[PDB]
RNA sequence: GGCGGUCGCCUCCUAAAAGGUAACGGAGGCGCCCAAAGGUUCCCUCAGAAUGGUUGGAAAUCAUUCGAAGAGUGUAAAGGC
RNA sequence: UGGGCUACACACGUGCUACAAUGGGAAGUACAACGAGUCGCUAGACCGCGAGGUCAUGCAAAUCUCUUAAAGCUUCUCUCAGUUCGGAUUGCAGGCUGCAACUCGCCUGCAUGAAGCCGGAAUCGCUAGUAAUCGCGGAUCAGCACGCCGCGGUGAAUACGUUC
Ligand SMILES: [K+]
Ligand SMILES: [K+]
Ligand SMILES: [K+]
Ligand SMILES: [K+]
Ligand SMILES: [K+]
Ligand SMILES: [K+]
Ligand SMILES: [K+]
Ligand SMILES: [K+]
Ligand SMILES: [Mg+2]
Ligand SMILES: [Mg+2]
């Protein structure tokens with residue numbers, strides 16, 4: 001995976017939006033197109049609406065999701081069976 | 083016998099240990115080198131001192147039921163958080179990016195020509 | 197006799213104090229233990245029951261009584277009088293010896309053992325324990341077994357209520373959840 | 374107790390091989406090892422890997438790390 | 454009259470609280486079975502339900518409690534146990 | 535900008551790897567050719583189980599490097615077993631390239647260890663340095679092929695004949 005030296009990756013525009021809200025009694029949804037961004041522990045408690053190609057899917061970030069990309073929780077293809 | 087598994091008595095120790103879930107070829111060599119048991123002796127020839135040394139060595143590692151619960155918990159987590167991988171696990175499809183238009187028979191099971 | 201020794205010396209004085217028993221005869225005691233193996237597979241092959249009975253004897257040390265179907269059922273392919281099921285009744289010393297091994301030897305060998313149920317009381321102070329698989333008992337030899345089978349262990353006590361039976365069983369040794 | 378219908382059953386001593394704990398009981402099992410017991414008697418000796426005095430549930434003392442929280446796993450891998 | 458049905462035996466209702474009592478009145482059985490499903494001696498008590506319990510499911514075996522008969526009595530019904 | 539072209543109850547084409555002992559594993563030892571290279575090919579040393587990393591060296595090159603080729607040969611081992619065969623799948627941990635590898639990358643370690651016991655009707659290639667088998671280089675290319683193009687190593691069987 002991504003080299004340990006490089007550290008974990010998150011887009012600064014997304015990281016800024018979460019940082020602006022950390023000290024918030026009531027959080028609000030963060031609309032993002034950054035599927036590539038890693039879920040940091042600071043994301044826990046937020047709902048990040050992730051673009052899946054056509055819409056923003058609201059994903060609630062539980063502490064069990066840390067380390068996974070935001071895109072892992074916004075499937076791009078719809079398949080209900082043949 | 084060693085970790086609750088009757089390892090093959092006729093085989094050499096390096097291989098007999100591999101019949102333990104969580105011990106592969108490389109791990110078997112490591113535990114024998116630590117205990118000091120020659121790799122070529124059939125386990126039928128292992129003395130109680132050698133067997134107990136192996137059991138002591140193996141007890142350090144995570145094997146058998148302990149390993150199986152550990153891995154199943156990992157998959158359980160992927161499903162619970164609703165990740166893409168978890169859905170792949172739950173729907174019986176390849177989880178590591180493999181194409182499914184063809185092949186994927188290991189995950190899917192036998193062909194349903196219908 | 198170790199568990200019986202524990203019961204008469206340690207358990208009895210404590211239970212009298214906890215429940216304020218005016219006379220010692222009120223103290224609940226284990227009346228009997230009945231191990232039952234419901235073997236419906238005897239229909240498909242009679243020897244599965246035969247091998248089941250052999251293992252049941254080694255676990256308890258008593259030749260089991262082969263129970264028979266009292267009623268015919270077509271769904272189970274069962275005919276009245278067919279020998280399906282075996283049970284053993286342990287009383288006195290043989291009961292205490294078995295209960296000791298169950299508490300101290302058998303239960304720890306249960307795969308991923310997190311204790312025995314705590315709601316498994318009939319409401320009258322009798323506890324029944326469902327053993328999922330054999331090979332927890334040291335007598336089974338782990339290789340003779342062809343089909344892994346379990347058993348219903350019914351501990352019958354003279355306690356009038358679940359609470360007293362729960363306490364009695366706990367102090368006698370019981371890994372309740 | 375009827376004669377010649379029951380399996381052979383004798384007093385025996387189980388040993389916890391993880392700690393050497395032993396107690397007196399009866400069993401139908403046999404072994405090639407015997408030990409002396411207090412009160413001046415000898416009984417066959419049966420080897421048990423785990424007993425109630427060495428099982429994690431009964432003792433309560435575990436031997437693993439109880440897994441690693443993913444938030445803790447994340448912070449450890451990167452020192453945050 | 455024909456067609457169909459019936460033809461001997463057992464149980465019930467009809468049958469009017471003794472018995473008997475008819476109709477091409479209303480319902481069912483029989484032409485056996487059992488070597489114990491007979492005799493006797495000794496012993497035993499059911500069906501279901503609730504609750505708990507590995508495989509095990511509405512329901513197969515196990516335990517307790519409740520349960521006067523709601524079972525069973527080879528074979529119809531009545532009477533009986 | 536993100537997604538898709540990589541979606542998967544299924545059917546077919548072309549491949550790759552196998553189903554083992556004419557083999558698998560370990561150790562030791564030998565022999566090519568075509569090619570490519572400047573911010574590229576990288577010696578040597580050191581660190582790491584490894585993928586690789588680090589300092590650093592030569593070479594715009596029949597001078598230096600990629601590049602000590604693999605089959606092979608010689609010993610040891612395994613002993614017919616769904617196995618010490620097979621390496622799919624999955625868990626975990628890493629390495630690289632890249633602004634980024636969740637959808638969609640390649641590689642590494644540990645663990646896991648699927649089908650497969652030589653394949654129905656049918657069908658394909660090949661007449662010798664050929665088939666078979668073994669590696670090696672290159673184009674595209676940050677990274678990424680079991681494909682394609684080329685290269686050498688080892689190296690057979692058979693053709694009576696022209697009815698179909
Ligand atoms: K895919
Ligand atoms: K295909
Ligand atoms: K291919
Ligand atoms: K093919
Ligand atoms: K060899
Ligand atoms: K990718
Ligand atoms: K083939
Ligand atoms: K390339
Ligand atoms: Mg193994
Ligand atoms: Mg792919």
Ligand SMILES: [Mg+2]
Pocket residue numbers: none
């Ligand atoms: Mg009258």
Ligand SMILES: [Mg+2]
Pocket residue numbers: none
């Ligand atoms: Mg009358």
Ligand SMILES: [Mg+2]
Pocket residue numbers: none
């Ligand atoms: Mg009678």
Ligand SMILES: [Mg+2]
Pocket residue numbers: 539
């Ligand atoms: Mg395409």
Ligand SMILES: [Mg+2]
Pocket residue numbers: 651
């Ligand atoms: Mg074979």
Ligand SMILES: [Mg+2]
Pocket residue numbers: none
């Ligand atoms: Mg030609």
Ligand SMILES: [Mg+2]
Pocket residue numbers: none
């Ligand atoms: Mg060639």
